[PDB]
A paper describes a structure:
Partly conflicting data on the allergenic significance of dimerization were reported for the birch pollen allergen Bet v 1, an outstandingly well characterized model system in immunology. It is the archetypical representative of the pathogenesis related protein family 10. Here, we report crystal structures of dimeric Bet v 1, revealing a noncanonical incorporation of cysteine at position 5 instead of genetically encoded tyrosine. Cysteine polysulfide bridging stabilized different dimeric assemblies, depending on the polysulfide linker length.
We could crystallize a nonasulfide linked Bet v 1 dimer. These crystals belong to an alternative space group (C2) and diffracted to a resolution of 1.17 Å. In this nonasulfide structure, the dimer axis coincides with the crystallographic 2-fold symmetry axis, with the central sulfur on a (crystallographically) special position. The packing resulted in one molecule per asymmetric unit. Most strikingly, the nonasulfide linker connected the distance of more than 12 Å between the cysteine Cα. As in the tetrasulfide dimer, alternative conformations of the linker could be detected. The linker must be compatible with transiently formed quaternary arrangements, which are conversely hyperstabilized by a compatible polysulfide linker. This reciprocal dependence is nicely illustrated by the crystal structures of the tetra- and nonasulfide-bridged Bet v 1 dimers.
Residue numbers in the entry:
A (entry chain A), B (entry chain A): 1 to 159
């Protein structure tokens, strides 16, 4: 089955700067700015572009130990990043894959709006629990806010 | 049980104008701007302020025929509107009440960000299905976009 959650969130950071930090340097930044959520990000196969498999590990404390994600598409001009959760964490008997899309859109005032889609490819007739949809949304917002705070505290970073 | 969904959406309309149209004149506007979603809004008990019970009817076409909502709180200065879904529609054997909060926040550029909370008071140990959470979110966004389009098309309205 399929369940598609689209959300939007705003940031005071201009889109180009946010894309460089949140997307292009996230492997480096996330364990530094949000250690309570992400312990490490490592390359299993590939360079960071489309097809790359990453292992995202969570700190001692979580239900889930890690996930493996695959980079699907990166558009450096239009600030789009598409990736899939393909193993570990919520993937298992009820859920085959989560396909995600992030687009960072500039606002006239020099901030950004992030358009985020989380698409659950459920196994057979399985539902996705509302708590799972919420957990994914909250993780993304946690990471965004941590990166935003870091960027405000380090005014030259990613310029 | 309880399940709380917080979402945010942006509008190009300044907060004060949007509050006057979307909140303070919604009974009038919704059936006019979004007839495919709302057929009528009528007063069962009260004047439109806290404690008021409204009957919201849906057009021929829907699963649900109507809901009764109660106004909980209105802050005309800070652009807050809290209301509850108390009968009809999704209310029944699995769900006792939905308590909703809308806050319309001005942006420096003269637009708005709406902070919306949908809090499900489930009966006993019942879950809320992700499809239901999505349906509520989509209804609110449909109504917002319809009001926004109307306001852009009628530049003097609600000034």
């Amino acid at each position: 089955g399929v369940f598609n959650c689209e959300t939007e969130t705003t940031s005071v950071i201009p889109a180009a700067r946010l894309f460089k930090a949140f997307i292009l340097d996230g492997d480096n930044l996330f364990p530094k700015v949000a250690p309570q959520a992400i312990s490490s990000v490592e390359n299993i196969e590939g360079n960071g572009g489309p097809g790359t498999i990453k292992k995202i590990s969570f700190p001692e404390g979580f239900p889930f130990k890690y996930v493996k994600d695959r980079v699907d598409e990166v558009d450096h001009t239009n600030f789009k990043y598409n990736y899939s959760v393909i193993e570990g964490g919520p993937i298992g008997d009820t859920l085959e894959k989560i396909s995600n899309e992030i687009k960072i859109v500039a606002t006239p005032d020099g901030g950004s709006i992030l358009k985020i889609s989380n698409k659950y490819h459920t196994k057979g007739d399985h539902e996705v629990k509302a708590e799972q949809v919420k957990a994914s949304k909250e993780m993304g917002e946690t990471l965004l806010r941590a990166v935003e705070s870091y960027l405000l505290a380090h005014s030259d970073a990613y310029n």
